Amino acid sequence: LFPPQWICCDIRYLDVSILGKFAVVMADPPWDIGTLTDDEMRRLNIPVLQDDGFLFLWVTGRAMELGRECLNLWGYERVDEIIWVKTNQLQRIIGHWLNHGKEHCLVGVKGNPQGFNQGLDCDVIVAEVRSTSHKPDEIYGMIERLSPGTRKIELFGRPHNVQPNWITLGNQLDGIHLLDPDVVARFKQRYPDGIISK
Amino acid sequence: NDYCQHFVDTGHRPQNFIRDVELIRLKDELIAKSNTPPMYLQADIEAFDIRELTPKFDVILLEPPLEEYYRETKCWTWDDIMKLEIDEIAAPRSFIFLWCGSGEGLDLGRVCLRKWGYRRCEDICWIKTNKNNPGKTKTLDPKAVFQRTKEHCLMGIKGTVVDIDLIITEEPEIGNIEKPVEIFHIIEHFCLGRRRLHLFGRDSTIRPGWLTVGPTLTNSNYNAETYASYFSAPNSYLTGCTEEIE
Numbered sequence: 001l002f003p004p005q006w007i008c009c010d011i012r013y014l015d016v017s018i019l020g021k022f023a024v025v026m027a028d029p030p031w032d033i034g035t036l037t038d039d040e041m042r043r044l045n046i047p048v049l050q051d052d053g054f055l056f057l058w059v060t061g062r063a064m065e066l067g068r069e070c071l072n073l074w075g076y077e078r079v080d081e082i083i084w085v086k087t088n089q090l091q092r093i094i095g096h097w098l099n100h101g102k103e104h105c106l107v108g109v110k111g112n113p114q115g116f117n118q119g120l121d122c123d124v125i126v127a128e129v130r131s132t133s134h135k136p137d138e139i140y141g142m143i144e145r146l147s148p149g150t151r152k153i154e155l156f157g158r159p160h161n162v163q164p165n166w167i168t169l170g171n172q173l174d175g176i177h178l179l180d181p182d183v184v185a186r187f188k189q190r191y192p193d194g195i196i197s198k
Numbered sequence: 199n200d201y202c203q204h205f206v207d208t209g210h211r212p213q214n215f216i217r218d219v220e221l222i223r224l225k226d227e228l229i230a231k232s233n234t235p236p237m238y239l240q241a242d243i244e245a246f247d248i249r250e251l252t253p254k255f256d257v258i259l260l261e262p263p264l265e266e267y268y269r270e271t272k273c274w275t276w277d278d279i280m281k282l283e284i285d286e287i288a289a290p291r292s293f294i295f296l297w298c299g300s301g302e303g304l305d306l307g308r309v310c311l312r313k314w315g316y317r318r319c320e321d322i323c324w325i326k327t328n329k330n331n332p333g334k335t336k337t338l339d340p341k342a343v344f345q346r347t348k349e350h351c352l353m354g355i356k357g358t359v360v361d362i363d364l365i366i367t368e369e370p371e372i373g374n375i376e377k378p379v380e381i382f383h384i385i386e387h388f389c390l391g392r393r394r395l396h397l398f399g400r401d402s403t404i405r406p407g408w409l410t411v412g413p414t415l416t417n418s419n420y421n422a423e424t425y426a427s428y429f430s431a432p433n434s435y436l437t438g439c440t441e442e443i444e
């Protein structure tokens with residue numbers, strides 16, 4: 001069901017098997033560079049979310065390496081790396097050796113995705129910084145052109161991250177908003193009283 | 199303005215629209231005064247005992263000729279590179295700058311850094327504009343999801359030890375494999391020491407303050423004893439950013 005959907009949850013404890021399979025996963029985890037430990041990140045049940053498709057994983061600092069570990073542990077091969085060049089309103093550019101002008105987003109592939117429009121966009125995003133950790137909305141349009149109309153899921157999203165065709169998971173979302181009948185049914189069967197524990 | 203959409207529409211890369219791309223940089227002058235004479239050696243790095251390069255280096259810039267650099271144009275695989283004995287010539291406290299390209303090297307270059315005993319402290323991205331040829335499509339790597347418009351230079355540190363982690367220039371002509379000379383500016387302004395090695399450098403990259411070693415050099419002047427004499431006492435520990443010792 002096309003309109004935005006979301007689930008306020010602790011992503012460590014949600015049974016993500018109820019959500020089905022997705023053409024694209026995106027995550028912006030709170031790396032321990034309210035953070036998740038390295039082991040909690042490794043143990044996230046990312047493998048059940050896709051059979052064939054792409055994972056977009058935001059990283060900074062030592063998560064450039066830890067994120068690569070998670071990506072591989074979860075069954076992906078890193079095949080691209082998007083750079084977001086951070087600018088002000090006048091398109092000027094805004095780790096203790098160098099100032100940082102950018103953030104990185106690893107692109108992993110699982111299986112053999114068919115029918116994606118690879119090569120339409122380039123791997124550099126030039127976009128304004130907004131609030132802290134707020135990622136650029138340009139990535140949603142890149143992902144939509146890569147895989148139009150398909151189901152996507154975002155992990156650790158905030159309210160401003162919800163988007164059509166996306167299901168957003170995160171602990172700062174407001175309640176639960178689910179419209180896909182497949183997902184509603186499996187959510188009701190798994191959480192009859194709406195409580196997500198353990 | 200969505201510059202991603204704009205690139206889809208026009209072929210102008212988003213980085214084409216980045217603008218402007220203390221004052222007191224007399225650091226540059228002290229660097230130039232501190233610089234050793236340029237020294238250089240022709241050597242087939244595959245068949246060369248790297249341990250002959252003495253003394254141990256404070257900084258190593260490593261620029262192996264990856265196959266991905268020759269898209270329309272001896273290439274080194276990451277198998278070849280990983281087997282270089284870089285740890286045998288790096289000082290116990292020292293730095294490495296490894297050009298990794300834009301594909302599997304972003305992973306295998308990190309494997310190399312750890313193999314040689316470094317940890318990554320910076321990821322420097324060379325972002326390439328196409329202001330002069332917006333209508334010139336890529337030809338993607340088979341595994342690529344996106345058009346690749348940048349290269350990465352990884353900085354590694356081993357031991358107990360003004361610029362930004364971005365270099366922006368126009369994409370060079372086909373068959374031109376040179377990296378932006380700005381990487382030398384960044385490295386030298388860290389003031390890491392004066393024993394500086396550039397592996398797989400070329401005649402075109404020879405520079406004061408650097409020892410350049412590579413297979414395509416046409417001439418050599420390297421002598422290990424002469425080179426070591428540049429760093430004998432009282433000059434053994436200079437950063438390359440302070441005044442010479444009288």
Ligand SMILES: Nc1ncnc2c1ncn2[C@@H]1O[C@H](C[C@@H](N)CC[C@H](N)C(=O)O)[C@@H](O)[C@H]1O
Nearest residue numbers: 009010011028034133134135156158170171172
């Ligand atoms: N165990 C957890 N489960 C779900 N969400 C969490 C958890 N821990 C932290 N979070 C949230 O993950 C988000 C991390 C942010 N970096 C995400 C930023 C977001 N991508 C944006 O563009 O604004 C925050 O909302 C955290 O409160």
